[PDB]
Amino acid sequence: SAIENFDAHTPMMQQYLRLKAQHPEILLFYRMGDFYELFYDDAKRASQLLDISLTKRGASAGEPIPMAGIPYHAVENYLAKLVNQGESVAIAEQIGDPATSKGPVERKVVRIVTPGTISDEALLQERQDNLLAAIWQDSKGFGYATLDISSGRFRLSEPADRETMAAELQRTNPAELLYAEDFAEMSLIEGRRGLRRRPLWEFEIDTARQQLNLQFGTRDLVGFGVENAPRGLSAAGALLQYAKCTQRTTLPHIRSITMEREQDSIIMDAATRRNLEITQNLAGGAENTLASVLDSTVTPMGSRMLKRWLHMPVRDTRVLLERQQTIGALQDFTAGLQPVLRQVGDLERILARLALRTARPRDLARMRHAFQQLPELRAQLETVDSAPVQALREKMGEFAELRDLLERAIIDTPPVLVRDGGVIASGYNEELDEWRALADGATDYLERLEVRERERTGLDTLKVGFNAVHGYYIQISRGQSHLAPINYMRRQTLKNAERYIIPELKEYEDKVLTSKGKALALEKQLYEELFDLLLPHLEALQQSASALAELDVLVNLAERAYTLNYTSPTFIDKPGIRITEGRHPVVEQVLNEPFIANPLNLSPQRRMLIITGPNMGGKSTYMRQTALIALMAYIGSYVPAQKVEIGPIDRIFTRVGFMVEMTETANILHNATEYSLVLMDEIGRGTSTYDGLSLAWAVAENLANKIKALTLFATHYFELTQLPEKMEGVANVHLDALEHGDTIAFMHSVQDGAASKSYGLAVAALAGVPKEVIKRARQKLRELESIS
Amino acid sequence: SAIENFDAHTPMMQQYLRLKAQHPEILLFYRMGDFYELFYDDAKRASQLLDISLTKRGASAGEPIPMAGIPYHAVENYLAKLVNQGESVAIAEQIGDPATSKGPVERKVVRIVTPGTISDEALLQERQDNLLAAIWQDSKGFGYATLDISSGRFRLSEPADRETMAAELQRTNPAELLYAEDFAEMSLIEGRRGLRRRPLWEFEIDTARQQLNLQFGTRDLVGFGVENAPRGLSAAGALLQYAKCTQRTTLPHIRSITMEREQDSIIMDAATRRNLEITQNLAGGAENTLASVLDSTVTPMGSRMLKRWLHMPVRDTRVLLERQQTIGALQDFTAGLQPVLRQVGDLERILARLALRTARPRDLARMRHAFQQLPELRAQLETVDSAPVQALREKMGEFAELRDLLERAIIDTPPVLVRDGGVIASGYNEELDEWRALADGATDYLERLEVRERERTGLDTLKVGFNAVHGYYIQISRGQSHLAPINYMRRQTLKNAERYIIPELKEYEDKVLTSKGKALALEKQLYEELFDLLLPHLEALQQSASALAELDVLVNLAERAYTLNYTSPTFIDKPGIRITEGRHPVVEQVLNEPFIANPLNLSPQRRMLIITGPNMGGKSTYMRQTALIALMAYIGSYVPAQKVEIGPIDRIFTRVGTFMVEMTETANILHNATEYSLVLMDEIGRGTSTYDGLSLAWAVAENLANKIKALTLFATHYFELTQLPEKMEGVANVHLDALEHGDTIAFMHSVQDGAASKSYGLAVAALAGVPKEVIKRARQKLRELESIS
DNA sequence: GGATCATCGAGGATCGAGCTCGGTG
DNA sequence: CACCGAGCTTGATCCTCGATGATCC
């Protein structure tokens, strides 16, 4: 090993060292001319992650530095790979003037690209939330906070237990997860993506309160109703500090925080969320999910918002009623609204780039286009007699000042980057128009010169061209090169051409580049100026984008409710579910022939249903569709049924069927209430004769008589059909099956009472089993059936 | 839409539409300068499959032509993406010089890259078989053939029924599958990859017999013992014609064909193959598979061969005994052999590229390196008292003539491609040495000219460089450019440099170019010449590579047997399995908590074992370890046990682990199982009601015991079936106990006689932390029902 | 029909600062 | 005796020649 003390290294490597010292463990994109160079294990790692060239740079103090570098103009395709990989990156830039820097130029880490704090369009997934979360454990319980950097949506929670925390982890699904060093239950977290171990002092309450009050500009957090959540504030404080470190600027879009209380939303355990296949089927794909069907939103921001609504069913009936009324009122206006809403696009993530001062020309172009739709939206909504519509129409705003600003400032279709100019429009700044006049005098001036010089010289091959390196020139063919006027000054020789410069041309070249340099520098002044003019209205713009997004969701759900023939569910104060011709919203759309609709009647006098009938009969589907109907009822959406009356639901507990089973069941029985919805799916793996059955008789008895939760208890055990005999508030239903020889047809139709027989025989007869074996099974069944 | 008729297009585009007509449905890599361009539908699909630039050609024919292209020197990495997606590609090349062609230059489809016919190293997966297969359906039965284009392994079969065909499909797992137009049961092949629909006349017997006899140079196929397989020959005939069509070349490595007979191999259905996790766990991954553990072979060729052996367990006792004896004789020699075998590498797929005349420089280098190891292998095997070892040592050969040839011909480490020459070594060819001596003697002249011109001019920045377009030049800095001698003729100006030429430099440039062009052209003559000298010994080299591959498998299994402490299984004439301290070969290695070994006694007096107890990955494992032990016993390998006696096994049925799929697998077992069959039933009847599930399991257990009399390990939760041994003979009760003590449970993976006498679903629920009232309710209600039993 | 005129690919230096060597006045 | 003036150091990016075919009045 060579001696690598601070003094022995070169001045640029010493500058790299202290910047790298403030980011020891993450890759440092070090701006070096036109290339973000990395060094040592950052270069060799970058080389392996990005598939780029690992070169080296000569050092005079032992080890030549392992070097890997990326052009500043191709940096995003390599960050895309890293951000996909759950990798944090600090972007160091050249700041100062090279002409007045004898040693290394002034450099700064201006932003850290992390998997939960990315705003750039190309890095993010169009229709997926990308949330940066913080978790924190105490002796008492858990403290949690999630921030959508690209909307400024910062939410909080204090999960009571380990099981609730695992349900919140799965619900939110953080892209980057900050956790404290004294975190005990590592089993919840270890193996999750974007895992960042941080010190304890980052989770200090006094620093958190100060930082959050400062950010919101409030005296206390009484206004937000999070003053009495010290656990959740500790997480939010660590998160905000991390967010202001990954940007090293103010986050003005973060003006508010809301608490997601246990009684505010329906708490669905990890199994339920997976079993219902909300945004993720059990295989991990996005096909045959509740999102894929319900999500026909015309904006990605609405897509996420609807997907956000699906993840968290709201229990506040007032919000739900307003959505139900709205969906009903807008159902007639969908055709006219959707094509207008479609043009708005992803305005949410554009405002994030405005707030972070990272917005690109076409972000401002789409924002301008979004404002141009507001009048047509305001016009089409004015007649809709609905208080919530008029509330979101007022919240929508106008922004006539900002609409005029962008219309004057920016051209119709600017390029991707301001770097190469041509973004600010003509008339806005008449100094800029003057600087451009010289730059765009080339079409006539240099063409006029070409004619004069061609006619004057009498060299027919004479043509005026430009070259990025050498600048402008007069080009003559090799054959006619020696005949050039003596006033022509040799500049560039080519294989079959000679390129010259004349006093009038070098005057032009000197002035056309100094004009470009001025025009370009002023454009970037006027560009950074637009942020100064737009940031003050960010509050109104966020509420506007939030209102437009919410409109897209409810216009979509209005389209879906009409197209797929859904109805409005009504609410009662006490527990119960009365469905009439209820369907599975996903399965009926994916399988291309009519799904068989079924009713439901759950009440305190009829709270448990013992569901018999054959497997692959849609027994599991019927219980799922109920939870999905309950989900969609408590997102404020219309439901796939002819009629639904539903009571308050605090939790949905689902067990689909070993160790994990009995564990999930125990969690259900402990934490379930009368208001809880329970779906038991033939849960049982008995290690003896009735070991499984005996447990399902005692679990069904407990749920019915002790907890008294609304339950759909699907079971293959035929002995459980004797529970209604001895237990009150327990009833038998079954999915009918029709035997017709060596085959069986599944009706998928729920009937009262227990199924006439079991169909293990029928399934075996369809397997094509020898007749003596079948006749033996029919004989031996009647022997054992005789025992009861 | 604008008219794209044949006449309106350019002669070049007409030449594309000519050759594209002979390949209507597959992507055509059209060589266009230094780019394999595609056009119209081919360019937009390629753009979407490869993630390349979809560009356009300015045309005289209406719609501007959708164009997508890849450089000729980068073709492979893009073919890799296509052939692993199951995409066939025709590679069209420029053959003539375009400058002396009045119309478009003469072009040719030299090879078709198809998923089952890839010869190139980069396209193939190192340690996975890539079979081109042909299937046909007849009024009589099924006809099948598989070709490993790389190994020269040509196989055929006439699967007995629909079930055997599905088992053969899954076993072979063809990369490309040829099937006839009158193929009825499409359900067998419905979702399979690389599906090619072909006409029926390609499956004509007289054409097949003629083509196969021609290829092997035989009068009849009596020699191969495939003369009385008309169905299998029809498939093989269509397959050979397709293989010749894809290469457009003779296949001299295809000299032999072997039949996969029904009585030669243990028939395992698709479920068994998946459930045992041989090369593929149920999740589809390569981890916790029999291959991943047993495959410590030092060559990919050996890796595939061992993997091929695992897929097809042989019943010929003579082959197994030779492997068992060999593995035993190699045990003490392993340490010295494996590092030598490791250097051989993938010689099998290299010989494929030799036979197809597609071999790349480093393929010839690794072949030379493989020959250099033969003497050391032959030396270390010399004393091994084993007829099969000495048989494979003789079959190995020497090739001292070919070893010397390649040592003289080719340099130590050539580049990846012949394109830029520098492959043929100095001394081999006196003409080559002359063409290079001029190329390097000009290089030293032009370096000496740099010194002369530097001293003469007095310009310190003066530097002699080279450029593909310009050739050579003299480079001076912009500051010192005007001081250049007047005889210096400016050619190229740069930002801070000027490049010149003199008649003395272009005299020397004329020598370097003519030296290059001749040296390069002659190198490719001497390169194509090496194939002419090597092809004649291909038969001996295939037998050599086959012997080396087989040695690597048996050296590996000898290493594994010694390292993992396996023993040699002995065979009896009638069915039975007597294991002493048998282990699961995978699970014991993956979990570093020491595995609990157990015996087995299956016989006609003890055919069915009713296995009770908590499963906890010890009941399913115990049944699967038996099938794996039976697998490894009939691959000729040592087995994870202290002693094993095993009888003949014709099939292995595993319904271990949708309830409809279970009853389907079970139905297939009961229909086709014999006394020689091994059956593993894992708590079937789970999904349907208490009584109906039990009723089926009773009927199935009674049928298997009394009617079929197959060797069965019948795992169940149903405790009523533990009364079967009371009634009838050849049925016995065993169980895995668990020991309750406080707030913990010890799950014993140790097999005991009799039926389990306790419930532990209560105990596991009590550890889950279930309320005691619910537990006591379950125990209360159980004792009410169990006391009546 | 024959000088004239597209068109796609191949290299290729540059982009641009920074450290190091090399004179150098 | 410091101080200018050269070297080369990652993937895009024009840029121009190469090589070729196409052209059409």
Ligand SMILES: Nc1ncnc2c1ncn2[C@@H]1O[C@H](COP(=O)(O)OP(=O)(O)O)[C@@H](O)[C@H]1O
């Ligand atoms: N009510 C229904 N109408 C039509 N098809 C249905 C219905 N219920 C279920 N199915 C179909 O049957 C399949 C099996 O349903 P599932 O609830 O999984 O059955 P089980 O739990 O009995 O195995 C579903 O994928 C769906 O395609």
